Amino acid sequence: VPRGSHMHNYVIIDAFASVPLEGNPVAVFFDADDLPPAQMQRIAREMNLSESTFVLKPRNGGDALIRIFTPVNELPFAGHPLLGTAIALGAHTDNHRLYLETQMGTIAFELERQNGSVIAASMDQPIPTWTALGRDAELLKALGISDSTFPIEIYHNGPRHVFVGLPSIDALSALHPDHRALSNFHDMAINCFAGAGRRWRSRMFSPAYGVVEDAATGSAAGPLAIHLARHGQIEFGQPVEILQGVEIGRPSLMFAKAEGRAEQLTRVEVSGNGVTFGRGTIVL
Amino acid sequence: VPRGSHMHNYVIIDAFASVPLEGNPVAVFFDADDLPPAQMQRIAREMNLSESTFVLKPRNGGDALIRIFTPVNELPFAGHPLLGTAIALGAHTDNHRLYLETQMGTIAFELERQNGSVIAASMDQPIPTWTALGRDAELLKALGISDSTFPIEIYHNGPRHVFVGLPSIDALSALHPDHRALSNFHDMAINCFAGAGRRWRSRMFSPAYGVVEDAATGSAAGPLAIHLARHGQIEFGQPVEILQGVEIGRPSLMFAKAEGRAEQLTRVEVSGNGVTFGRGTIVL
Ligand SMILES: CCOc1cccc(C(=O)O)c1N
Ligand SMILES: CCOc1cccc(C(=O)O)c1N
């Protein structure tokens, strides 16, 4: 029974995974031009996934304009939701590349297909800026630890991401943050990392963005590759694999590479697999 | 593209609401007899709603057997998920009454239809047992308040529900619990209430059941009617309306009535409206 003038089709994509029930889900809503943004926000709250996206007609030469909502706020750019959106739209085109307009500009995607299905995509992210957070004691207390292995810096590529280093994967898994205390950190996500060489583990916490713990924070993957190189953990330009979401039962694998030098970054690439979990229609 | 031997259809019901985007969503999965329970749990985690339910063939004379999963655990009975399941199954029968088998026994529902759609249902809940929680100082500290207006008691009807009284609706809305501290309260939900006469407000918090704050805790509505009468706030048998979820943007209206006396309860009725938000199919 419709409860509006338009129904909307949607697909659920598990981003940063090659099998369903892993990765980070995103609900992608098609033909969304009739929806007021306040209604988009309410739909995102209804789905209760880390993000829902809304596919709109392009306005600046791209293939589509995408608006991105967490359960509580709109974001101007986000990695897992746009990866899932690109994979979902990939089912309706033969094109190798897709150009998704966002509030941070047009994001270029390269799609990978196997046996007629889009199985993965790679994006060029906005090049982030960064500075010291300057709230170290407060943040470490909220996380329940005494120190970060590296300087605590906050990066901006639309959302904001703070990085806190842990000395081992066991120490990362042992974190039990005070999420009420973390709620004093507005308009940012807290990304905690540990690992070595090519392979890193992450956990992300963001009351500001409406989620206790997120499974795959794609817009943090590019900045982490920069952060690791700036602090001598990898060489600049080394590709990394970032496994997030293990503790919450949503293992997600993000691939990232940042080209250049800290003061002259030229590209920040993030890629991953994705798979369709479901499809449906909503009544408004 | 299927990722299993069976796909499953589902519907999303907004329980305890008469308009979509209000109430508490539940995902109801049909034809679920092929799914192992570990897979049901993973699907519930994927949907990330307070509950997903799975419709199985009946084994004890009912219409269906329903298994109920939060994002983190199975429950033996729950009110909003069974209300939504009854409404969803109501679309596929003409019957006025539906009998849903659960781990707590067979739950009887009366369906209300208007213009060919099921718009509401009423259930007879298990009669709860109760005792003093005996953890008052710990719980009040976690909630961030100094006292409860009434004795803090824990009720069992499958899940467990603790009730903490607040002196005003403003005081209820002002709560900002320490959810990490609440995680020391296992196998229970914390229900905080305020109001007067026929009309009450509630908020529910349950890290044990995988949710920071739930919008409509239907298995707490029956016990609250008992609790209010035992503590002199209403007469035994007075119907109450319980509005939950306002602060999180998911206003949900639960109707409850408990018949008898505290020591000889004969019926605990909970009812509400529900509406279909969406329908779809998953790949496994
Ligand atoms: C709402 C919590 O989750 C997130 C917040 C910010 C960014 C992303 C992303 O994928 O870049 C994200 N999944
Ligand atoms: C998982 C958090 O939510 C809940 C917990 C326990 C019971 C119910 C219910 O509706 O009776 C519920 N919605």
Closest C-alpha to A64, from A24, A39, A25, A29: A29
On whether the CB atoms of residues A29 and A51 are closer than 8 A, the answer is no
**DSSP one-letter string for A91-158:** TT---SEEEEEETTEEEEEEEEEETTEEEEEEEEPPPPEEEE-S-HHHHHHHHT-S--SS--EEEESS
Closest C-alpha to B9, from A280, A284, A162: A280
Q: How far is CA B46 from CA A204, B29, B80, B97, B245, in A?
A: 18, 13, 19, 31, 22
List chain A residues with CB under 8 Å of B12: 46, 280, 282
User: Is residue B121 in contact with ligand 2, taking CB distance under 6 Å?
Assistant: no
| Residue B139: strand pairing partners | none
Q: How far is CA B263 from CA B128, B164, B258, in A?
A: 11, 22, 12
Q: How far is CA B12 from the centre of its chain?
A: 15
Closest C-alpha to A275, from A122, A87, A123: A87
**CB within 8 Å: A281 and B282:** no
Name the B residues in 162-181 with CB < 8 Å from any A CB: 176-180
Q: How far is CA B137 from CA B73, B102, B147, B213, in A?
A: 27, 35, 8, 21
- Taken as a whole, chain B contains a residue count of 284
How does DSSP classify residue B127? P
A51-70 burial: b if 16+ Cβ within 10 Å, else e: bbbbbbeeeeebbbbbbbbb
- Taken as a whole, chain A contains a residue count of 284
CA separation for the pair B12, A7 (Å, rounded) = 14
Helix axes B79-90, B218-230, angle to 10 degrees: 130
User: Ligand 1 test: best mutation among A13, A157, A219, A253, most atoms within 8 Å of CB?
Assistant: A219
On whether the CB atoms of residues B70 and B43 are closer than 8 A, the answer is no
> Environment class of residue B176 by beta-carbon count within 10 Å: exposed (0-12), middle (13-18) or buried (19+)?
exposed
* Structural Rg of chain A based on CA atoms: 18
User: Is residue B206 in contact with ligand 2, taking CB distance under 6 Å?
Assistant: yes
CA separation for the pair A47, A64 (Å, rounded) = 22
Q: How far is CA B236 from CA B106, B166, B233, B270, in A?
A: 25, 21, 9, 15
CA dihedral of residues A253, A40, A68, B251 (deg, nearest 10): -60
Q: Where do we find the tokens 């009110």?
A: B79
Closest C-alpha to B254, from B244, B246, B245: B244
Method: X-ray
On whether the CB atoms of residues A207 and A183 are closer than 8 A, the answer is yes
CB atoms within 10 A of CB B114: 8
User: Is residue B85 in contact with ligand 2, taking CB distance under 6 Å?
Assistant: no
Task: Give the closest ligand to the alpha carbon of residue A74.
Answer: 1
Type of residue found at B246: V
Beta strands A240-244 and B153-156: pairing type? unpaired
**Resolution in angstroms for this experimental structure?**
1.3
B211-249 burial: b if 16+ Cβ within 10 Å, else e: bbbbbbbbbbbbbbbbbbbbeebbebeeebbbbbbbebe
On whether the CB atoms of residues B48 and B71 are closer than 8 A, the answer is yes
Helix (H) or strand (E) holding B80: helix B79-90
List chain B residues with CB under 8 Å of A280: 10, 12, 278-281
CA dihedral of residues B161, B162, B165, B168 (deg, nearest 10): -50
User: Is residue A189 in contact with ligand 1, taking CB distance under 6 Å?
Assistant: yes
Residues 6+ apart with CB under 8 A from B125: B77, B79, B107, B157, B219, B222, B268, B269, B270
Beta strands A97-102 and A74-75: pairing type? unpaired
CA separation for the pair A283, B19 (Å, rounded) = 11
Q: Which residue's C-alpha comes closest to atom 13 of ligand 1? A: A217
With CA atoms as reference, the chain B residue closest to A20 would be: B3
Give the residue numbers of A marked as catalytic: 51
How does DSSP classify residue A60? S
End-to-end CA distance of chain A: 10
CA distance B12 to chain A (A): 9
CA separation for the pair A255, A85 (Å, rounded) = 17
CA dihedral of residues A74, A78, A83, A84 (deg, nearest 10): -30
**Domains defined along chain A, listed by start:** 7-125+274-284 (3.10.310.10), 126-273 (3.10.310.10)
CA dihedral of residues B102, B108, B109, B110 (deg, nearest 10): 170
Task: Give the closest ligand to the alpha carbon of residue A83.
Answer: 1
- Cα B96 to ligand 1 centroid, rounded to whole Å: 45
CA separation for the pair A128, A135 (Å, rounded) = 20
Helix (H) or strand (E) holding B121: strand B117-124
